[PDB]
Design a protein around this nucleic acid. Sequence first.
RNA 1: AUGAUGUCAUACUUAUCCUGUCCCUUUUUUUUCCA
Lengths: 77, 224, 81, 42, 816, 111, 191, 45
Amino acid sequence: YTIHSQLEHLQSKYIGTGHADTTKWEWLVNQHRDSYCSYMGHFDLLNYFAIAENESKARVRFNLMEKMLQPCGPPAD
Amino acid sequence: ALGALNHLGELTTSGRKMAELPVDPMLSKMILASEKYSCSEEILTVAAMLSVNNSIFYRPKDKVVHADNARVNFFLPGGDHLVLLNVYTQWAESGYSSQWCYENFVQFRSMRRARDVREQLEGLLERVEVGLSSCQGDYIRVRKAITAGYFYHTARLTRSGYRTVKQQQTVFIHPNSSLFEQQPRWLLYHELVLTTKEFMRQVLEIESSWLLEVAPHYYKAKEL
Amino acid sequence: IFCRKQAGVAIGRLCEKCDGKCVICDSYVRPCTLVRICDECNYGSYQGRCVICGGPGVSDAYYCKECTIQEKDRDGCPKIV
Amino acid sequence: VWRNTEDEILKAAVMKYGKNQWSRIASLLHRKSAKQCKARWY
Amino acid sequence: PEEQKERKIMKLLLKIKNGTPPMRKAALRQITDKAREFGAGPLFNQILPLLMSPTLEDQERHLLVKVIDRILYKLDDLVRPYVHKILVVIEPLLIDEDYYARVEGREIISNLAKAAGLATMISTMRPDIDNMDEYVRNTTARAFAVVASALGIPSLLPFLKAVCKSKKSWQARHTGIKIVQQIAILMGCAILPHLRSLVEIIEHGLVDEQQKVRTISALAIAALAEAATPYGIESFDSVLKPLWKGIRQHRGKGLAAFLKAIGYLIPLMDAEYANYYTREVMLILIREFQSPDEEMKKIVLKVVKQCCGTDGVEANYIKTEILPPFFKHFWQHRMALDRRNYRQLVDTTVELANKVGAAEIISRIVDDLKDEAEQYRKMVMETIEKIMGNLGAADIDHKLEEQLIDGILYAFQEQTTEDSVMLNGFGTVVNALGKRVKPYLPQICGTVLWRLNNKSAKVRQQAADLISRTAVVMKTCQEEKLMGHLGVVLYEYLGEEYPEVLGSILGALKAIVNVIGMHKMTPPIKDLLPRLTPILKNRHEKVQENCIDLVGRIADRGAEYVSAREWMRICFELLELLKAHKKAIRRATVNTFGYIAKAIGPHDVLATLLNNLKVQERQNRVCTTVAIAIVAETCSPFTVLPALMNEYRVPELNVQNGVLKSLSFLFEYIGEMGKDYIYAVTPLLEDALMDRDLVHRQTASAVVQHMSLGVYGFGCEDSLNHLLNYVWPNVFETSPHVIQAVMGALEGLRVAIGPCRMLQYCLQGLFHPARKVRDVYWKIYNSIYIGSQDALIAHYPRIYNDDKNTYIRYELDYIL
Amino acid sequence: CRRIVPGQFLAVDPKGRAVMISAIEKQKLVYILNRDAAARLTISSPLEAHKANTLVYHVVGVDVGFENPMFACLEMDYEEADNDPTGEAAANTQQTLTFYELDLGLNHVVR
Amino acid sequence: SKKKLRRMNRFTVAELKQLVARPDVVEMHDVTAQDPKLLVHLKATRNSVPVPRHWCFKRKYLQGKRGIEKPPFELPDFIKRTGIQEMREALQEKEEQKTMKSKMREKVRPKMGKIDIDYQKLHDAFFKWQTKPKLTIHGDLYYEGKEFETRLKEKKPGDLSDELRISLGMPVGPNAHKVPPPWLIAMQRYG
Amino acid sequence: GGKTGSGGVASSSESNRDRRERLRQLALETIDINKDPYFMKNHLG
RNA sequence: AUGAUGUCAUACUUAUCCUGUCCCUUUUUUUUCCA
Ligand SMILES: [Mg+2]
Ligand SMILES: [Zn+2]
Ligand SMILES: [Zn+2]
Ligand SMILES: [Zn+2]
């Protein structure tokens, strides 16, 4: 259970993990944020979207980082 | 915490009575606890022992084994305090015999001054309003009055050694404890020193339940 | 129990009892990369000690090639304090 | 002392070998000697 | 009353003290927003007595200083009227032998004076610099250092000018001077933006009448030098002269600290100053070379180390000037008798050696190898060893080297303690004499041999050691008669029965055979090793360690001056070294099984290993299973895999588990060349993953782990898929070892098979009714997520969007 | 290309004294650079600025004159907007142009 | 009681099966799950792999395999071929007959190189005749008794066995084609 | 008087292994002389 | 048809241990009808 002190330290360590009660909302929103961080990181899906819509890389990443805030609806209750 | 002070720091009836009483409160709280537990005489004689203990048993090198033996004779189940109780009991039983302690490897000085401190304690006992009672062989009352006095002076088992109840600082048992190999789960002591390693003296095995009996305001259950 | 307060540039070392094994994987083979520890488990009387034994720092704690394939060596000072 | 398992291993050994070959029966038993074997049986 | 209520609701410090980390979040957030309204008026009086309560613990302190710092950030203004109170109640903590009391008082005072109302500080703590008590002056002075950390010196420097130019009190001039030295201790490099402003502050008191202020200002010079490394007297020249004159026109405590400061500036100095200043101070030094005093000795010798260790103290200078009185009065028994003097006298004397060579220092401390207090000659070899080990022995001339070698022999005989002191001394000294040692090898050995003859074990053992040291140079001077001697004579002593000597003899023989190879050894190993085999039965850790070392060397490299039958007997003896109580022995044993498999073929040694697997008691079964792995690694695994697999059919437990554990180690050891035997081994692991026992499945899982990490990247993913099918059911398990080896198998299998496959195995049980299954799947998915969280972005399912949320990812299905 | 491991943004100090590495959430470090005696560059252990629940739209070094170097990041705080079941805190949240600062003397990064 | 009101949210198995788009999945305890719409969409995704059987059970994993008797492991062909097994059988019988005294006598005077088996026999097994075993593709977890379950869902008529042919009166082998079984006779007779 | 041409004396591990094996034969003998149809020796011994 | 309960010995696991341990200085507190 000191293992648990370390393990909810691990929950505090890695944003996106889970535990047996985790809610569909936390799960899917964390995966959605991660999806955004990687669309930004990988230099080429950025071209994919930039080219799919008719936007430009500054436009693209600005949208993405705005969306990063409430990507999957408002919260659960 | 012991109950000599109100929540603002002045004197309770319990609190005054102990200051007039000769010796310190922890002991004093235990003596008052004899009032509740009807172990008057036994708690009295225990007090008389802890007054002077530090020199009870002579432990010469040139007679180590016979000495350890005239000691190991009295070793009672429950702890060092009731050990002392029976030891004094048997000495006075012998009629305050000096050769008794000489045969049984006990410092006559310690014994007889302790007897004197108990007798003058009894001479205080009327003022501190104590009824002269026996536990009738019920050492449970004895250990419980010991708790009602020395709840603060407690440790618990940890798998990394014996460690305090409160501060969880790490102690060890004195080698010469009547429980030194017994190594109980719920421990009471009387000394707190750190010789070559942290130590505690005149120790006894307790119930953590008596702790919620006595000090639910100081000792809460979740911490046991 | 682990320190895990994050990594640094200070190498770790092994007593001679502990000589040879990896820090976690407990291997004896094919060590690839050197170990690094934190300043806090770097200072003072803890300079040059055995991450495992606590003995004197003489031989260099290393990282079993499996541990580097799975990058369990990118967490920092794993000192069992 | 003596435990159900050993007592039955004894029983079996004796009933096979006979009641005067105490040294081999002792050899079957781990930490038991022929004095104790003979006493236990008799 | 609202004030008592606000405190009532304020004691959710219980919410933060006890409770969940959920509790911590609720209360921490609510108060971090309620901080202004709830105010520090009531807080501080509730707050100080807990922070001072005797046993508030590490993290209680951590959390409460979290509180004080963030609530003081919050309430830059709403903490105002409690400043002197916080100040004086926490003050002793920065000057306190608890580094973390220093740290935490430091940090919270940083934030306190930081968001504080500023003038307040000055206002409160002006009149205390003039105070009468050096106690309070030191406390407030090191406070002022902390307050300069909190704010910055500039805002303060003129008020420092005041507290240091005061003509009312010397108390206050001393106070300002120690404020100076204190910041000079604390901020360190951060002073060069001023670098002389403080020097100005201090120019007033090195001439002062109170020795207290004078000499603490000397130490201020010291501290400023320290934080003010080699950048020299472009700031400090403004005070160099009072130091200079007081050094001589003074006596005592001033001599101490003023010498300390001047020696701290002696690095920063330059020739036309660091020639005149040093040359002048040297005559002070010569009168102080007889100083009885301890911290005197420390300061003067440290001084000398830097001072007569510059480029402007001539070789000639020191050799004619410092050395005679230095050697005279410090090379008395007293200093080696001392606990401090031993090592520090070492320090500076090794440095003077570094300065001026060996052909005089060595000569000045030769015959201290024959003094009385064995501690003394112990010290002199401690030094000499350090010295020649760092420097080399180039200039040591003839007669010098003679008296040295001879004092060496003496020290080593005279030895009366079990110490590596004289050993290492000897090793180093001949290590540096190199080839200079030719003509005394009769002498050196004859000594060692007569010792080898002694009655008491200890000296015998010592002489064996010393042989093991000088073993290499023994040869390198071409000791035909003499190294031949040591060879055959040790072959003689191989009959000892004092384990403590027998072990050292084996060590010395090993350290001879290292230099002289096998095929010119003086006892041919053809007779050595036959003699060694009956020793392997000596049931003692030290002799066993050294014997198995020697036999391992021989079986590695010699190996052909012996017969197959000899190697077989030695195999049978190794089989019961696997029960020694020391692990070095057991690892050496396994290595030599490897070497013997190389020399002789593998098949007979493998047959003798399986029969050992039949034993019980686990730690020699496990070490034979290591040995099997090792034999297979050296002589290619196809030679041994059929025999292992076939032995997997003997119906006994310990042996089926021995086979499985051995394959575990084998796949670990070979690694990327498992892409061959993965197919051969699968149907045996699937066999043992369909139950046979707990340990059966624990071990087959370990094997899967190591196979996966070996076959990473070679395409054998169908086989690891097949074995996933069999490992994954054990996921619900309880025994720690079993479930743990299972989890390990799944991390290995995660890199080797990819994280899609394993996210699919982990999909359906994330949101299961139960809680045992929910918890195991979230444990796995956590470990799958931590490592390789970034692949998964292309592996997540498609999870439809209900009414008031959006859940599909349209980003990913733009067409293009 | 993770989310909380640094590397997406990286800035320097205009003079060439320190670098900061930064992620798009929860992590940024700083490295100090000194010529060695032979002027062959060295790099000591890194600093820390772990602050939870915070985006970063950029990080950049501010040009100070031989003071402590310091950096201007943007920021945001998705925290509340995920505590509010109404979507109010989605709106009404403000970028916070902020500066962290070195302290090369005391060797830490202060907000 | 709040768990009990969510328990009134704890819908019917018919509630589920009618709601859901893929009704094959819906099982018993599905409903006591905090998010059954998810749980069922997941369990109806492609390629995903369902929880083992045995989380319900009170018996642990293969304590049900406890009872039976089991035959020892059967080597791969290409390893039998190289004739190791007979070497090992022979050595076994030798050393089970030999007595303790002779055992130690052979410890002190070994029968060095009693046997031999040549390389290129091994190296050709492992490098020239090694072959793909039978593997099971993604998803098919092994559960207790699975190897006992015979096999099903071959509704095909042409599926015949050789023991089937023998104990039905028809031919085995290349004549399993040109042999119409005794059931094709009444297929021709009445359909 | 011993004899020449002999090994040593069995070490306690081998003595233990064969004590075990002899015990097992003792068991097989008794279950033979008592004719038990309710017995099995499993593939793990 | 496998429950927990156990003071059950045996079997078994971690290349898990054989090297992480020990005895107090000094000394002090007022008292109550006798029968
Ligand atoms: Mg004869
Ligand atoms: Zn490791
Ligand atoms: Zn650390
Ligand atoms: Zn170690």
